[PDB]
Amino acid sequence: MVTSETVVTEVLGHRVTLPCLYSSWSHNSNSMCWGKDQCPYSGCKEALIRTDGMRVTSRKSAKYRLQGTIPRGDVSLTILNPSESDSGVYCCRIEVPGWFNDVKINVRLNLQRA
Amino acid sequence: MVTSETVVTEVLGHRVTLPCLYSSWSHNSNSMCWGKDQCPYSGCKEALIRTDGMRVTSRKSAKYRLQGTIPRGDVSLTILNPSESDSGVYCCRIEVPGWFNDVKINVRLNLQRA
Amino acid sequence: MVTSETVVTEVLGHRVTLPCLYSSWSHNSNSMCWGKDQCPYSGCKEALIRTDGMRVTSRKSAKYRLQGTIPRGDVSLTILNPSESDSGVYCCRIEVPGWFNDVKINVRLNLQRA
Amino acid sequence: MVTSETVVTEVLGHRVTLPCLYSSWSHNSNSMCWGKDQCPYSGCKEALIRTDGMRVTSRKSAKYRLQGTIPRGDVSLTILNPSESDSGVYCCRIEVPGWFNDVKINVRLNLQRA
Amino acid sequence: MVTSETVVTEVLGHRVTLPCLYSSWSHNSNSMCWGKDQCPYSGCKEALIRTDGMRVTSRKSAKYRLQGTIPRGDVSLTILNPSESDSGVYCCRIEVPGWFNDVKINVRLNLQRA
Amino acid sequence: MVTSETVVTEVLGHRVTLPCLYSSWSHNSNSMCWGKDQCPYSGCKEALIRTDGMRVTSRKSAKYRLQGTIPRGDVSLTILNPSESDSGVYCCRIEVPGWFNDVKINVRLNLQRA
Amino acid sequence: MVTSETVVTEVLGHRVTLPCLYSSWSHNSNSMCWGKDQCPYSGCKEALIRTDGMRVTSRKSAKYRLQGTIPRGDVSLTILNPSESDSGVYCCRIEVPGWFNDVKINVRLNLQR
Amino acid sequence: MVTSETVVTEVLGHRVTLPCLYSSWSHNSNSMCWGKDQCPYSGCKEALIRTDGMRVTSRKSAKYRLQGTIPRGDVSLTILNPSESDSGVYCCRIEVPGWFNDVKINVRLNLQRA
């Protein structure tokens, strides 16, 4: 099957950001989580980071951060002080009410030397 | 910098194709080549496969084939008897006349066993 | 899950056509079948009507016909002398080579009286 | 004649929602109603549910709910405890000032078992 | 009710053209006619000018001409030796098979002196 | 030369509205006026009705009213107690700072009996 | 007043091309000419170069050539042996039958050292 | 390489604004500067004028002004009493965190005589 994904090509030494925007976001209905390699399953249990529709509900992490305006659907992932092992495919799962309405948006991180 | 790429998720044992289309194609002006991991450098010289404006000019490779119609801009890469080592990023470079007009189109291949 | 479909509103007894177009069609690789209520499963068995990429390979219906240019991807369904039992949802399944590449297109037929 | 409609494919046992959005909505000018199979006539009486510019003013049953933010034009229909008989075509009628300006928006609900 | 129309602002003294293009045109199914003030009724009888799928079938007119390529759907109206009385609203009726599939496209002509 | 316009087809006996929306409107920079047959000249002098960017500043005639939200760019014209002589072409002129930046928006009104 | 134009940033030493496409082109009705700084006046006389709707009708020039397929509306301008003085705004005037129907398309050429 | 730019045509002696809008602007992340003929380099340390994401941080110029709301991304340039030497190409550089994410936006100013 053929799908599409975003590619972020970056340099080591500063935090990097993986874009995920869901413009129609509403704090009343939506929530979100990030996973590596694969999308977290429905109900966002086993994720890198997670939100409720307003803010991060995940325990505070040294690595993972959401620095965008979450109530407007800017759930972009910030990865602090990245290393080469952080390279690879990430999945942003937007939770949508109802049956099989979730949106999965993929971002590939490619870290290289300046 | 952020770009985008096509993802092809496929199964082993049959030929797979990585889509690459250049609608504006004209045989007198355009040319093309394919590369793995990275785009070949300007002048498409050490690539997986290469064409002029009409046809494949590099050898006759058992693994790599272009089965689409090149003069109409269908330069999709076909890979015969693919194995797991064939997974990864491929790059399709459309050569366009002039200064920095070349088009680079990326496709990530993911092969599963099923 | 949320999708979309075309609705064809016609009068009982008049031949009707349910639109289904696949612009990218190739006589070498594509095929198709139509189903009522649900799309036929892959391999288009037990269908209203079916093709190979050139022509209808199904026997012949007094009712069902493909009158468009099948090798150019116009696999629109024509229904002769439709009756009230012919109202309802139809599904046009385009068979595409590879893993989960098939396209499903829905058309709802609504027949009226006078 | 050919029109288009959205299809909502859902599972039994939980409330389902049928989208109907009118962005230009104003509590001063607009009102709305929902009907089954056919759109309610002008003046939105004999309906499943109906509003003024702000809120629901009458419903045929507690089964039907408008839970979106209505003054912003989200008059999407929620159906509580849906059963198989709830499947079929629904029509959302937006009332607009002037002569023949009403908007009719159709949604087909498909409830599945298993 | 609100619709839209094209406006042609022109000068007297040379033939003028009112655009009407129907890209989907096919000589096997489509035909057309022009009317002044209103589109002619279905079946395009007592019209300014009329065609079948290929060509003008109404008597040759000293005033009205179709100079575009009709089999490709260019059924734009040419008006020879225009005078001020030629100003006003025109309607281009595309005849399409089936129930209420005809398309009406309106053009208002405003002719000026010199 | 070819342009386009909105057509409002309405009935006598009730107020009618002619649409003119300018979304980028700002009370600090924009103003507007309506004219019959032609847009009023630059400076909107002797128009049907005119505003200063916030509200109508001249010629709320009797007939002519602006009931939309002017600061949000809804400068749609309401004509109270319309008669047949009110049919015809109207022009909405949006005044914009700088050289020849004004926008002209045309609406043709067609009034029918009742 | 605010309009738009395409920008061609190129390098010296090879012929350069300024795009101008009119998809709707038909040889019976359309014709075309190019001008520098400003559009040539109606009646494409004179331009750097001009056509009749099929092919170039102006004298054959050493500097200016139209290498696209003109009957399909590819009236892009090719400039042979460009120098810095060739930089600036160019205007492609597509002639269309009737009153004030002509299309003007602007391209700015920027040549670098 | 081929890009596009906005053209502003104004009359000498009148203040002009050169549009530059960046919708995604955030006071936390973005900064900007304007240059003539060419974009200022990364880090905007010469330029015509510059901001820190909230306001102009370059010392006040008699010529150059940013009068739009900078925190919403309107970094349009206002030039007071422009003279003939002010004609020409301008470049608006939006600075974005990470590697090669800066956006370059061009405006050509054309000043005409009174």
Numbering used by the authors:
A (entry chain C), B (entry chain H), C (entry chain F), D (entry chain B), E (entry chain A), F (entry chain E), ...: -1 to 112
G (entry chain G): -1 to 111
Task: Please give the exact wording used by the authors of the publication that reports this structure.
TIM family proteins exhibit a classical type I membrane protein structure with an N-terminal immunoglobulin variable Ig-like (Ig V) domain, a heavily O-linked-glycosylated mucin-like domain (MLD) and a short C-terminal cytoplasmic tail. Recent studies indicate that hTIM-1, with some other but not all phosphatidylserine (PS) binding receptors, functions as a common attachment factor for a range of enveloped viruses, including filoviruses, flaviviruses, HIV, etc., through direct interaction with PS of the viral envelope. The Ig V domains of hTIM-1 and hTIM-4, exhibit two antiparallel β sheets with the front and back faces formed by A, G, F, C, C′, C″ and B, E, D strands respectively. A hydrophobic cleft formed by CC’ and FG loops, located at an equivalent position in hTIM-1 and hTIM-4 structures represents the putative PS ligand binding site.
While hTIM-1 has only one molecule in the asymmetric unit, there are eight molecules of essentially the same structure present in the asymmetric unit of hTIM-4. A striking structural observation that was confirmed by sequence analysis indicates that the Ig V domains of hTIM-1 and hTIM-4 share similarity with the N-terminal immunoglobulin-like domain of sialecsialo adhesin 1 (SnD1), hTIM-1 and hTIM-4 could be superimposed over the structure of SnD1 with an r.m.s. deviation of 2.3 Å and 2.2 Å, respectively. Residues known to interact with PS, including WFND of the FG loop, are conserved among hTIM-1, mTIM-1, hTIM-4 and mTIM-4. As to hTIM-4 and mTIM-4, three extra residues from the BC loop fill in the gap between the FG and BC loop. Results of binding assays performed using SPR showed that amongst the proteins tested only hTIM-1 Ig V could bind EBOV GP. In agreement with hTIM-1 chimeras, the T41 (BC-CC’) and T41 (CC’-FG) chimeras gained some ability of binding to GP, but with a lower affinity of 73 and 208 μmol/L, respectively.
